[PDB]
Design an enzyme around this catalytic site. Sequence first.
Site, mmCIF file in Angstrom:
data_model
loop_
_atom_site.group_PDB
_atom_site.id
_atom_site.type_symbol
_atom_site.label_atom_id
_atom_site.label_comp_id
_atom_site.label_asym_id
_atom_site.label_seq_id
_atom_site.Cartn_x
_atom_site.Cartn_y
_atom_site.Cartn_z
ATOM 1 N N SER A 60 5.351 -6.022 -1.317
ATOM 2 C CA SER A 60 5.646 -4.587 -1.444
ATOM 3 C C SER A 60 5.901 -4.036 -0.049
ATOM 4 O O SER A 60 6.749 -4.603 0.656
ATOM 5 C CB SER A 60 4.520 -3.892 -2.217
ATOM 6 O OG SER A 60 4.231 -4.575 -3.422
ATOM 7 N N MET A 61 5.192 -2.990 0.396
ATOM 8 C CA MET A 61 5.420 -2.448 1.730
ATOM 9 C C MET A 61 5.250 -3.510 2.812
ATOM 10 O O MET A 61 5.922 -3.451 3.850
ATOM 11 C CB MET A 61 4.437 -1.310 1.974
ATOM 12 C CG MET A 61 4.637 -0.534 3.211
ATOM 13 S SD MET A 61 6.359 -0.170 3.573
ATOM 14 C CE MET A 61 6.792 0.773 2.089
ATOM 15 N N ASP A 91 7.959 -7.366 -10.506
ATOM 16 C CA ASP A 91 7.459 -8.165 -9.376
ATOM 17 C C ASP A 91 8.300 -9.413 -9.189
ATOM 18 O O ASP A 91 8.477 -10.196 -10.119
ATOM 19 C CB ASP A 91 6.010 -8.587 -9.611
ATOM 20 C CG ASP A 91 5.020 -7.446 -9.491
ATOM 21 O OD1 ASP A 91 5.399 -6.345 -9.047
ATOM 22 O OD2 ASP A 91 3.875 -7.641 -9.952
ATOM 23 N N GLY A 99 0.812 -1.197 0.000
ATOM 24 C CA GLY A 99 0.000 0.000 0.000
ATOM 25 C C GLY A 99 0.857 1.263 0.000
ATOM 26 O O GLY A 99 1.897 1.326 -0.655
ATOM 27 N N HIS A 126 9.093 -5.324 -5.194
ATOM 28 C CA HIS A 126 9.081 -4.643 -6.490
ATOM 29 C C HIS A 126 9.329 -3.155 -6.268
ATOM 30 O O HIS A 126 9.305 -2.663 -5.143
ATOM 31 C CB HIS A 126 7.762 -4.888 -7.257
ATOM 32 C CG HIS A 126 6.536 -4.260 -6.651
ATOM 33 N ND1 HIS A 126 5.260 -4.593 -7.063
ATOM 34 C CD2 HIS A 126 6.382 -3.313 -5.697
ATOM 35 C CE1 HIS A 126 4.377 -3.879 -6.388
ATOM 36 N NE2 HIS A 126 5.033 -3.097 -5.552
#
Lengths: 181, 182, 187, 182, 181, 178, 185, 183, 185, 184
Positions: free
Chosen positions: I86-87, I161, I57, I111
Amino acid sequence: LVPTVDIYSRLLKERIVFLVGPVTDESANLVVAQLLFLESENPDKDIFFYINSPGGSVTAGMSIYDTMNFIKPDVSTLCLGQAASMGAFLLSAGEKGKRFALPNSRIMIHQPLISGGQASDIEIHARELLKIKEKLNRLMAKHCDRDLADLERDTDRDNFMSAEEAKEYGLIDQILENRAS
Amino acid sequence: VPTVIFDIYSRLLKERIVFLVGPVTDESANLVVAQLLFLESENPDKDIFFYINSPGGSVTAGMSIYDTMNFIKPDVSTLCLGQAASMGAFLLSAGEKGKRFALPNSRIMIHQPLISGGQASDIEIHARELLKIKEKLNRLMAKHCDRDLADLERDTDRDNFMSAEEAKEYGLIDQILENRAS
Amino acid sequence: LVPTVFDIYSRLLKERIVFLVGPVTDESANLVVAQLLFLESENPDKDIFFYINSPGGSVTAGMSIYDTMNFIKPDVSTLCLGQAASMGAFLLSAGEKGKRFALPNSRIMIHQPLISGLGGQASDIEIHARELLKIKEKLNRLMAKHCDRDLADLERDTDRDNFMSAEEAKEYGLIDQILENRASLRL
Amino acid sequence: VPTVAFDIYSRLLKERIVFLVGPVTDESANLVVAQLLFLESENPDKDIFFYINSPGGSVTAGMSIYDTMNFIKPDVSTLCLGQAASMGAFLLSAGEKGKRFALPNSRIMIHQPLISGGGQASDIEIHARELLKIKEKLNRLMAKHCDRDLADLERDTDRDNFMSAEEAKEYGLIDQILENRA
Amino acid sequence: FDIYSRLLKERIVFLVGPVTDESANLVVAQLLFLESENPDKDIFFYINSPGGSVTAGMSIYDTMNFIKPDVSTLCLGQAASMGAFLLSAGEKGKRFALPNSRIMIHQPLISGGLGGQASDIEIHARELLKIKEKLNRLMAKHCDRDLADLERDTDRDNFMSAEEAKEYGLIDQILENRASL
Amino acid sequence: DIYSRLLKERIVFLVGPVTDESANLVVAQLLFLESENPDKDIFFYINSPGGSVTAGMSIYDTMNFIKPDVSTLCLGQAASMGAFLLSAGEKGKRFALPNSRIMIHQPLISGLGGQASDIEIHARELLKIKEKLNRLMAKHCDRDLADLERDTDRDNFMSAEEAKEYGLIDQILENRAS
Amino acid sequence: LVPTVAFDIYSRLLKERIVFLVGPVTDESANLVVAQLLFLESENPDKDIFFYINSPGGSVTAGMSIYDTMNFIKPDVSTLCLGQAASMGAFLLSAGEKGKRFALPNSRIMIHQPLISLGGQASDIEIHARELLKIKEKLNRLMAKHCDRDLADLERDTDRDNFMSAEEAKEYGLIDQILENRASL
Amino acid sequence: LVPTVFDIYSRLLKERIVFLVGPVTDESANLVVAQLLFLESENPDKDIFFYINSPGGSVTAGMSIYDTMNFIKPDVSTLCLGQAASMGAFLLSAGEKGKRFALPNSRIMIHQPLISGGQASDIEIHARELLKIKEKLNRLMAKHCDRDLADLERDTDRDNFMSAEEAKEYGLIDQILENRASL
Amino acid sequence: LVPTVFDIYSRLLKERIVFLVGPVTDESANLVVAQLLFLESENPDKDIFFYINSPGGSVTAGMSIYDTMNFIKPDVSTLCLGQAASMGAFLLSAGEKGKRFALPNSRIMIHQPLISGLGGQASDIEIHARELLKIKEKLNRLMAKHCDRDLADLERDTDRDNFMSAEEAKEYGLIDQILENRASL
Amino acid sequence: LVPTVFDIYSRLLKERIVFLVGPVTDESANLVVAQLLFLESENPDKDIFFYINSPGGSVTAGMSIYDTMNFIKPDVSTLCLGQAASMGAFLLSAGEKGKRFALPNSRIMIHQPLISGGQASDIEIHARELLKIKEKLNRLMAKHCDRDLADLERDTDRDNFMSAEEAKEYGLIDQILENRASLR
Ligand SMILES: CCCCC[C@H](N)CC(=O)N[C@@H](CCCCC)CC(=O)NCC(=O)O
Ligand SMILES: CCCCC[C@H](N)CC(=O)N[C@@H](CCCCC)CC(=O)NCC(=O)O
Ligand SMILES: CCCCC[C@H](N)CC(=O)N[C@@H](CCCCC)CC(=O)NCC(=O)O
Ligand SMILES: CCCCC[C@H](N)CC(=O)N[C@@H](CCCCC)CC(=O)NCC(=O)O
């Protein structure tokens, strides 16, 4: 989408005018224009008014009705598919003796319906709608050579009629199966 | 809704204050009815203070409040704050005579019924019912205001806005309250 | 959105008062049913006061209320405030006879069943049309019983929307008494 | 909304602080009225602190607050935080004179009544006349609040008129600007 | 108690997400409450906000300066636009950022500006330019910088790391943990 | 355009849903061709999923009314009213291409509303329509009404050969030598 | 959409000097009427124009463009109500050359005061409310003139929607004759 | 559908009649410009009759009409039928002086410019441009009407409706024509 | 919506377990921040267990969690359940070194930053593009530190990714151990 | 929609007049391109009169007109009527030098490129390309206006409106035409 040789303009040369689908100001005035045109071309020859319509606007329909009665030529009417509500009114308004239906056409008659504001304005418009109801019953009774009391009874709710039933009622004169009928 | 040692509206209900705020609907009207019946059950003889800030709404919903106001034993005093228009003005005028008040810059408005059908037979049925409603409300309003039926008929033909002073002159309310000294 | 004192409706429920307010749906009707069963459990002998301000709604939902009113032991007294229209009028007229009331400016309305032009094959439309007429006949017969009138009267009087004042509903046999205040009860 | 056995706004209601935040509606205005009446019954002898951060809204809803401020016994001190525009500035200027305040970077805005949103010419005439009556009343009442000539208010409300805290004090809408508790 | 009410017992107030009339007044309410609870103890104002309404933000700003307690500010995540203004407004010496915070400053913007007669547009444009001048003047005071620097550095979006914000004068220290104090 | 040119060969197409507009266009072309020559066959090519009963009847009654024989040909599909019109072609002159399909079924309604009295009126009319269509279809197919009732209770798909055996068409044409 | 006869049917009837107003009066539909009126005047300023009206009304200023053009050009503009002439439609119907205003037997007329389906500052609402009332007063004065009636009559009779049969419209003064069929000269 | 006789508007164009109907847009204004250039090309000395029934619209669109009216050799006579409001009234008043007409029940309306977002710097730029347009239109309107600029600033601050006679009294048009004998 | 055993998440907070579930937004991240501060206030010396099941996010929202994890005194142990992308993977890798775990069938994905909707003048787009490239490098540098890797490794490995099993994430350095059950520790 | 006399625009095309009206799109620009090539084919030596009333639009669509104006043999005279903003102002300034005109109340506006996302790598690529566009457009405009590049960088940073007189002094047009006697 209309083929050329358009096809409706070509049939107009045979004095055939169609009313197809809902009776609107635009579709009714197009019929009026064709009626005036055909009278201008020959005021003495019959016009053949083919009706396949579920009805529509009362005032739009009256513009056709009054034009049918105004012009000199007899307006013969023919029901194909269906003539309901104002369509059935116009069918029954054809020159008497020249109102026809195809054997499997359907007729339907009923009292006027609406698709408001202050009570004063609602009162005015309800009163106008009831005058329309009364006028339509009287004119329909004249067309069908029937009692006003019959039309009032028989239009209280949707009243579907076969071709034979519409003939018996007085809305049409003859059912045409083919050009020998 | 702020709370106190009960929320603020329940707290003011303890002082026999009932609010009608915003459009009169079946739900908003019946909540008032429930409060009126509750207060009567708590003490059938003490006045109830019915505060009205409403643009009007459903006639039958307003009638449920009106008939409850007249049915219960306590007097229902009415107070217009902000505005009482249409059914709101009707309920304002239905308070116990002598106990109908408006605050100084309150606004009243009266008018004939409004709505926003299928076959002509049904439209006739509903138009006749609407006109009977119009006559009944004018007759009841004339009684509330101590006025002639013909006056109410002319004065509700279109939206008729009234100041607090005019509503008092009309007979719709009894007094304008600036503070507890008037 | 609801003052407490228990909120106000729970408080009046202790006085054995149940409200039917607004359209009759499965959820609003079963809530009435639940209150009826609860009050019977609390005291099977004391009257229940069923206050109706409703434009009607679902027939099967209203029937769940109707059958519960007749099933439970206590008398269910009815009072029209505002309006009782369609299924609302049916339930009002279903109160224990002698204990059906309306406030003076209440409005009653009766009519035949209405639908929101069915859809599908002709066989299915035939089935649902036949059921709709059966519902119409049953409601006229039950209303004729409630009103102590001939079935033919109800058939005539529900063909289109039939609005009634409190006085007209009383004379029709739909309610027993009009109450302006607590001094109005007679008989 | 934090809790402190109360929510934070109920907790500050114990200090006699009432907020008007955002648009004035029937619902938000009546909630303020209920708080004013509640506070009066708790102690009619203590000031009420009416904190205003509002862009304005319904004139009749605002009048219900205005008339209640004038009706109840306690002084209603007003404080502009953020902004008091239109009916918000009206209520700000309606506080007990001597006790109308703004924080240093608050802004005030005044203007004539406006309508965001029809009918017959007769009906349009009725409602336009009522709108001008409101416009005249608000100019008269604002001029009294501000201790200025009526002609001043008519001129200065013709279009949106933004004022800093100091300009609002010079105009007469507030009495003092409060930088801190010193 | 919920988690935020529990941290309010520790005098922690959060500003999270856009600055609106509602979110700002909730901050104002907590600031007033904490002052009432103890007018002498610092309040810790944690800011993770992209900005929002200027007048809403001013209600927080003026309340921070009005109440007796020092209001310490902490940027976590980001403090952008009115968020950066409020961050820079904490008691001087007690304005902090976490190491990976980001600050952004810029001139005021209007979402859907321009609407009405030229006279009204003129009135509102002038008010917007006064707001722009006031924010630059006040920000320059917060940062111990010139009005001209703030004008230059806010003409377009100006993102700053925590160290850049410290050098600029917006905050006093970056705290990696409790020993970086 | 291409369709006006084929109309010079007395070819009329019904393609897609049968509506008042598409049906009357067919009617107009049939009347036009009769007026051009009342004695010569008309070739009515049908690729349609069906549609409005009354619109279809306007075509049907016009086919039977005009003097020329109307030969019908199923290409792609003729379902519901489309299959009704296919079977209504002049007997001996009703054709399908080899991989066309036919489908027959009872009337359907899409949706409105009203009082129980009105719903009864319209249900009765729909049932009369259902029986009339079964009676006419039985006549076209040289079959019994009870057969059509049984075989249209739900959607009944037919290959060309099944449709020929049923009596809806006379011949399957692979080419002009069939 | 429109049959051909070299000409679409409406162009062909324009050769008979027939002009239609059908449906709502808009700037575009009104100017099309204006254009046909000017064209027919140019083709022959010596022959009547026959203006067939089936309209529920519409924009007052668009209708005034037709009205002023009817009165400006040399030819008499005979009017005929077919179907209905309501509001601005009835205004234009009644504006035909006196003696040459017609209705078919079952057409209907309706007259009423101006309506709007206002917004901004109170000053602006006052400006537009005043303009709307000026329109109402002007239309009553002009309608009373067309109908050869007292202004007070029109003020009374347009306060709300006022429907009239063809016979009622003739008695009121909006039209001169009702036409049943060509028993005409 | 436009009647055919040429379509009806082309037929009236042969008599040097050009219509402006409905809102002034880039497209509707350029169509007028094209007709003005065509008519000048057909005969540079004969008057052009510019019939206006318009509620106004885009200022730059109108200026392309205005500047073309002033550029071409023929006098452009203007006629208000129905209404000439805002940019419509501007162009009406721009007709050759002595040849600006209204029909008896037409109405004129004049007012200051209106618009139907961004950084303060950009809003400042666009507000200044809007105020320049306001002052320019007031200056040109004052010239058209033979009035003081201060009169125009006062009289366009809010919507200012005018009857044909008021518009003549104001100096916006020259004559009201009931028919061709009104000349 | 949550069983009130006092709901289940409040109950697990008594065991010093904090959940990050779903997208990281300002609101969901600050809710995590508040729990982290609350647990430290209750006991600054006891480990906190941060369970992450998130697709990622907002970067700044995630940085508020990251900086709080590093700021507070308690060790923040992380556990990946379901996925940490991700985060989410960034926060997983940020747990106290030695106390970063994944369940056996967890999934990790890393990513480069992506933006949803840029729209403005070329000047503003340049400013925002530069800021995004600064974000991209800082996150790669911080991630490289968590994983005991080089910045160039992370730039290479986040370009598109990059999905990792639990074992692949352990080999990369994002977590310390895969826990099938407590006996794994 | 368009009167016949040819429709009115085809009639004016016979006098070598080409219009650009409203937003510059791929479709509207290529129609202009098509007319320019046609007029060159009809007579490669006579001036073309390109009338511009446009708020701008697509840069690549505008460049297709620009390169066609410079490619064909005839001089392309430009005239601003109403307004020439952004790509509209660019094309106006691209007319044959000496033959770039505006009507007296025309408006000109110039500014830097605008955009109304993806991975950071992709944003970097498109941001760099947008800056290239910005630089290239400033360089071409400086050439058209016979001005220093630094002037255009300064003067396109935000929306820059110009009266006809200001555009002439800027070097964007050559002469303001009040009527047919205004020409050199
Ligand atoms: C004014 C009151 C409106 C609704 C009641 C109205 N009086 C009568 C009515 O609606 N009866 C239906 C039940 C009502 C539920 C919503 C349609 C009967 C039914 O179950 N039909 C199913 C079928 O046969 O398909
Ligand atoms: C990237 C996003 C950051 C946004 C912050 C931006 N710099 C500043 C900002 O928001 N200023 C307006 C406040 C917002 C209210 C609009 C609903 C100022 C104002 O009220 N001026 C007078 C008027 O509006 O009439
Ligand atoms: C579908 C996968 C989701 C993962 C998200 C993706 N990796 C990265 C991401 O969310 N970056 C922005 C979010 C930060 C929020 C601050 C307001 C960072 C930023 O602020 N960039 C500059 C700009 O916004 O202009
Ligand atoms: C008032 C504003 C109107 C004028 C617009 C302004 N002059 C500049 C403008 O439009 N630039 C774009 C080109 C237009 C494309 C339209 C679909 C840049 C570009 O090609 N970007 C591609 C990339 O980098 O991905």
